Structures are given as C-alpha cells and as structure tokens.
Amino acid sequence: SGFRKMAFPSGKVEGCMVQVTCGTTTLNGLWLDDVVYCPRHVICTSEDMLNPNYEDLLIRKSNHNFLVQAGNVQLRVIGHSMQNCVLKLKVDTANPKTPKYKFVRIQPGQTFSVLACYNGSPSGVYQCAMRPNFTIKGSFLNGSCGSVGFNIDYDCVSFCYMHHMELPTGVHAGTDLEGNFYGPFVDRQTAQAAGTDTTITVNVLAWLYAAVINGDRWFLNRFTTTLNDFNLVAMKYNYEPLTQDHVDILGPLSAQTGIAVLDMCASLKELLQNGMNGRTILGSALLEDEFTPFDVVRQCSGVTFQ
Amino acid sequence: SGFRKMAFPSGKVEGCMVQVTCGTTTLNGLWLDDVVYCPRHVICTSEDMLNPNYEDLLIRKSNHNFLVQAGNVQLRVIGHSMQNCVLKLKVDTANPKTPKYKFVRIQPGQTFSVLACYNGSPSGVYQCAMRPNFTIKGSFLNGSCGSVGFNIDYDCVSFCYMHHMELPTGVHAGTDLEGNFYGPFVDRQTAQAAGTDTTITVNVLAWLYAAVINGDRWFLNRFTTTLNDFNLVAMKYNYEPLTQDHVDILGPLSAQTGIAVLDMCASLKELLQNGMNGRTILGSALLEDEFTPFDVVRQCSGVTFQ
Numbered sequence A, B: 001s002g003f004r005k006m007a008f009p010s011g012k013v014e015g016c017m018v019q020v021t022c023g024t025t026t027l028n029g030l031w032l033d034d035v036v037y038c039p040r041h042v043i044c045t046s047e048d049m050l051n052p053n054y055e056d057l058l059i060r061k062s063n064h065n066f067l068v069q070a071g072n073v074q075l076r077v078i079g080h081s082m083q084n085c086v087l088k089l090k091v092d093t094a095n096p097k098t099p100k101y102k103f104v105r106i107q108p109g110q111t112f113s114v115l116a117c118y119n120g121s122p123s124g125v126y127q128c129a130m131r132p133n134f135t136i137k138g139s140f141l142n143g144s145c146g147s148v149g150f151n152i153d154y155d156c157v158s159f160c161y162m163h164h165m166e167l168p169t170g171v172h173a174g175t176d177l178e179g180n181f182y183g184p185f186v187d188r189q190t191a192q193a194a195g196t197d198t199t200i201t202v203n204v205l206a207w208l209y210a211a212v213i214n215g216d217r218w219f220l221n222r223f224t225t226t227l228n229d230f231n232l233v234a235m236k237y238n239y240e241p242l243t244q245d246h247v248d249i250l251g252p253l254s255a256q257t258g259i260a261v262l263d264m265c266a267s268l269k270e271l272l273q274n275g276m277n278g279r280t281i282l283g284s285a286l287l288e289d290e291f292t293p294f295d296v297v298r299q300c301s302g303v304t305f306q
C-alpha cells in the first residue's frame, strides 16, 4: 500500500535526448529514427523572441547552421523543415535507442511525466497534469526548452508535450510533437493570458477512491447527491463539471470500494463547503487533482513496462 | 522557475533490474557486474516469514534453485551467499548495462529516488526521504520487494535502499545494499514499532528558501530568533533540533536570498505556532520536508547527469 505522485520510468526517453545549437541558442531535441524535433525558437536571438518572423528567420539558416550532439556524438543534418512551432532536422543516422513510440495530443486534465533536460542531458523526472487552461505547473530553467512530456504503455512511449516557454505568471506552455500549442499560446515573448484555471473534478474523485483503498476513510459521510446538485457546488468552487463519461470512467473504483460515485461526490461536496478542518488525505492538506482514474488503477494494481 | 518533487532519471537503474524466483516466491533483483542482489526473504514461503531461520532455509537451496531472468534472458547462477538481509547470486555474465555505481548508507533526512518494480519490470519512479525513524512512506504492492532507492552524481549511481517490507502501519522498511536494515527492523512478519517520527527541520528550511527563490514570500516576517529559542519550538512540534551543521549547509541559500538562516527560523516558528491560515507555499498546504538543501540547489540551478 501507500500512494505517491509517480512518474514513468524515463530510460526510453533519456536515450532520445540530444542538444541542438543554432547560432547563440542551445536547447534540447528529441531524436527518433532519423529526425530530431526541437522548438523552432532555437533559431531566435533574445531580440528576435520579442516579435519573431519565423519564416524569415529560418530562410537565413542552412542545414550546417544546426549543431546536433547526442552525448559527445555530432549528428549530420541533411534536411530541415518547420511544422507549426517545431523544427524537424533530418539527420543521416537513425537513433539506435529509438523506442516504440507515438505522437499524441492529450486532453486537458490528462497526466504525463516530464523529463527536465539541460544541454541534451536529463536532470529530473516528475508527473504533472495538463491544466484545464492548457498550462502546466512545471520546474523549468534556462536551457530546458525542448524537454518532453510522455506516457508509457508497456513498450510504447506516447510523446504528448514539448516545452516552449514560461509565461510571465511563472506557469509553462508548450506544444504536441506536431508543434501545435496546447491552449492559446504563441512562441513570442509577450504578455499572454492563460485564462481561468479550474480543478480537475474526475481526478480529485479518483484520488479520493485511492485514499479509501489505502485506509484514509475519515471524509466518507452519511450523504449522497445528484449530478446537478454536485455541479452547482463544482461551479461555485471552480471545479470542472462532472459528466456521465466521468462517472463511467470511475466505475471500476466504485465497484472495488462499494462507494457509489454520487456518494463520493457528496463527500467531495462536504470537503469543498467545510474544508479539511486541519486534517490530511494521503499526506495532502488540499484536494489533489494530478491523478487520473487510469493513474489510480495502475498504481493500485502495480502495472509495469518492459 | 517552478518547484517540483523531482526524481532522478531512472534509465541507469532500469538496465540493472531482474526477476528472481526461488520456489514459490518472485521479486526483484539488482544486477551489477556478475552479481545479483535481492532480499534474502526470496527463499521463504508465507509460513516461513512468520519466524524464519534464514541460515537453515538457505542450506536447503542450491545455485540451480535461484531462477534469475533479465528481460527474457535466463542468467546462470554459479554462486550464492547471504550478507546480512541480502542474497548475492554470482552469475556467469557481467551486466553489459552496469552503470558506474557505489553502495552508500544514507543518513536519516536524506532523500533518494525509488524505482518501483514488479517481476523485474520498472513501473514508476518517485522521490522520498528516509524518515528520522528510518522508515519510508512509499508506494509498494506485492512483488515490489527488491525495488531500489538511489541518487545520481553525473554518471555515478549511488544505491542506498532495497525494499524489504511493509510494517502493519503501512510504512516501508528496507536495507542498504550490504543488507543492513535502516532502523530497528527485521525481515520477519511480526509487529515492529518504528517509534516517534519527526519533521526534518533543515529540509523544511531549504524548501522555504526554494519558495522565496520562486517568489512565494508571504510567510517572511519582521522577526528573528536564536538557535536555542527555535529548538524550544522545534521540540514542541516534533521537529528535529537544528544544529550549526544545518545552518552551515543552508549558507548558500541564505547568501542568494539575503535571508539570515535565523530569520528564516523565525518565519518557520511563526508558521508552526500560527499555521498556514488557509494559504499555500509552492502549492502545498503543509510544511514540506522531502527536499534537502542539496536538492534545492540542484533544482534551482538545473544540474544534469549524462
């Protein structure tokens, strides 16, 4: 037993990280088969980032202006193209460590592991949620651009995130691996509103089921509620409305614990109205929303990869 | 910016995990050079674990009774020995993925990454502290025994922990890689007291410095205190006494922030007496003690490995 914010084992991704340098700027790239993916802002100076014309900036660059290093190994660039906000550098060597992989665009409220990298070198791994407002609350310093987010399914790495920027509010924005930003963000150093964030209700409920499974039961009450009554409460506390799709995804946790989803909603309701009264749930003094229902099942059933 | 509970990249350790089976029991082993390390309780039945005579149980086992599998690869066992609570299985093949490594016995309050494994297969990575009472609050299910804790320094993996058991209170106990338990625990299914745990004061102070560096400053007050006055407060709230060695380790964080360690102690004092008044620090509603001073420096300076 016990419950931890667990990241995927990072080894398959570690083998794909490289350093990419263009003029003055170095950041991380992702080397899969004979393509290296990195943020297109690798071609910008600090001045350019204020208001970049990426098409005009990229026209000045040739293959030989992209320095790509895998460890101490220099890769030869034989092609470059821009796809949305990412650069694809064709190289003359397929990465021998290329894992089975897919590119996925994740939904808001879904979770993934970030491998924070500097100069092509892995420094740390952590688990986070795509916020409803399409930001992430990460840990990123200079040089971390090009760091990637991912999920693993047995032997398949599903890349979902590439780090592009820190907003002036200190939260993080980036793209899928086709270079499409999550949310309204652009790769420009300008004020950008992220808009109202909300709590991921289905995740909080999943984590309450995890708590019950681990013997943290104090918040279970004598009450039930309705989807509509609960959503009146969710609206007031800036929680995502719960839908029947959410109820359906929680079904297996309901089944094991014998706690009807709407009964757990009444427990959540009472926590939102009353607070935690100085107590904790799975060692947290707030309601945790960075576990999906799928996360809780995996952890509570100890599912592995390779 | 931002601050996350980050684990080490796990790839170097993933390459060392194997499955070990003896009679009915399978768990994880650690394959370094031509030795596989695993918990000696691999030789026990459920009945044996009640009151094992490990010397008498091991005498019944021969090399060929230890089934060791690295992926789909069967390793040949040419030697076995018991060292304290671990078994060392000599195998006829050196692990080609053996990273540079050391065996270390860590101090209470030090942190490390756990790679949770089942049947020799990595499932997840998370960061935790060795509690002052020599337990860890992990996430471990059946089959996770032999999972290891570690730190990385550039290219060197320092193994510090091997998972042996869950106490009836739901916390976790294990050994260094020489098989010596952390704390008073034995590898027997019997009631075992862990004794009073305490909060790791130097870690909480390190995390308050991390908060200030990230712009979370609300808890900074107009007060200072003395080491003795602060330790009167630490005693009352079951915090570890702060020593001048702790003050010295915090020096670099003091220097950058301009906040004298004893001023930060007065902030901590006020938080312990007054509580958080429904506010958060780096997205936590309680005082976090699973970051060392060394952790905060690494993260706040973005230090990498290979």
Ligand SMILES: CC(C)(C)OC(=O)Nc1cccn([C@H](CC2CC2)C(=O)N[C@@H](C[C@@H]2CCNC2=O)[C@H](O)C(=O)NCc2ccccc2)c1=O
Binding pocket: A025, A026, A027, A041, A042, A044, A045, A046, A047, A049, A140, A141, A142, A143, A144, A145, A146, A164, A165, A166, A189, B001
């Ligand atoms: C003085 C303190 C507060 C300690 O640091 C900064 O102001 N740092 C930065 C200010 C402005 C830009 N950056 C870098 C680019 C370096 C100036 C040349 C930057 O934005 N780097 C990161 C991503 C950011 C940094 C903090 N958190 C993040 O996620 C990224 O790796 C990158 O390469 N961005 C492209 C880029 C290139 C030039 C100018 C801006 C951005 C900084 O690190």
Ligand SMILES: CC(C)(C)OC(=O)Nc1cccn([C@H](CC2CC2)C(=O)N[C@@H](C[C@@H]2CCNC2=O)[C@H](O)C(=O)NCc2ccccc2)c1=O
Binding pocket: A001, B025, B026, B027, B041, B042, B044, B045, B046, B047, B049, B140, B141, B142, B143, B144, B145, B146, B164, B165, B166, B189
């Ligand atoms: C019914 C529920 C509550 C869901 O599960 C259990 O009671 N589980 C277990 C009860 C008793 C023992 N174990 C295993 C051993 C299996 C029975 C054969 C066990 O202790 N396994 C783990 C470590 C534990 C399990 C939970 N958290 C941990 O850290 C370990 O991998 C191992 O191999 N231990 C050696 C061992 C061998 C035989 C009997 C006890 C222990 C269990 O998993």
Ligand SMILES: [Cl-]
Binding pocket: A283, A284, A285, A286, B283, B284, B285, B286
């Ligand atoms: Cl909390």
